[PDB]
């Protein structure tokens, strides 16, 4: 299943944590924090 | 800057056979009128208007109480 266009996902475990960003939000303002703005 | 919808013009009264609408004749005088009205207020009216939002400025007044 392809992930939701606008739910950014945080996951934390023994390895620490990560944030994963939908391909639809890269190139939006919400991508700017991740180095992937417009 | 005051304006009012007087109604719907009765030239459209048969736009439908029933609508929830109020149909009024076209105005039959001049479209423009100029008249001079000597308005009176009082210093208390200025108090009240400046003390609090009045009329349609304060709709939440419909709650009463506070």
């Amino acid at each position: 299943k392809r992930p939701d266009p606008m739910m950014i996902r945080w996951v934390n475990n023994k390895m620490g944590s990560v944030v994963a960003v939908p391909e639809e939000l890269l190139g939006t303002h919400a991508g700017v924090v991740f180095g992937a703005g417009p | 800057g005051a304006c009012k919808r007087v109604g719907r013009s009765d030239a459209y009264a048969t736009e439908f056979d029933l609508e929830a609408e109020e149909y009024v004749p076209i105005p039959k005088g001049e479209v423009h009128k100029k008249k001079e009205i000597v308005q009176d207020v009082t210093l208390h009216d200025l108090d009240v208007a400046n003390a609090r939002p009045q009329g349609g400025q304060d709709i939440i007044s419909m709650m009463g109480q506070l």
Partner: protein
């Protein structure tokens, strides 16, 4: 050019097909427009062919 007019976009007023007076009502059975109950009474007991003549006076027809 001999091609020279078009229909109005305004809504037309409604007149009684019998007496020409204004008509609030359209009869769903015969589709004649009528002024009042007195004219509705004559419309619903017209001689059988007459209904199409009141329509035809305004160029309307059943077919």
């Amino acid at each position: 050019t001999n091609i020279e007019s078009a229909p109005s976009l305004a809504p037309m007023k409604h007149y009684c097909d019998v007496t020409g007076l204004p008509a609030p009502y359209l009869d769903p059975k015969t589709r004649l427009r009528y002024h009042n109950k007195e004219i509705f009474a004559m419309i619903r007991n017209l001689p059988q062919g007459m209904g199409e003549q009141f329509l035809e006076a305004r160029g309307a027809h059943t077919v």
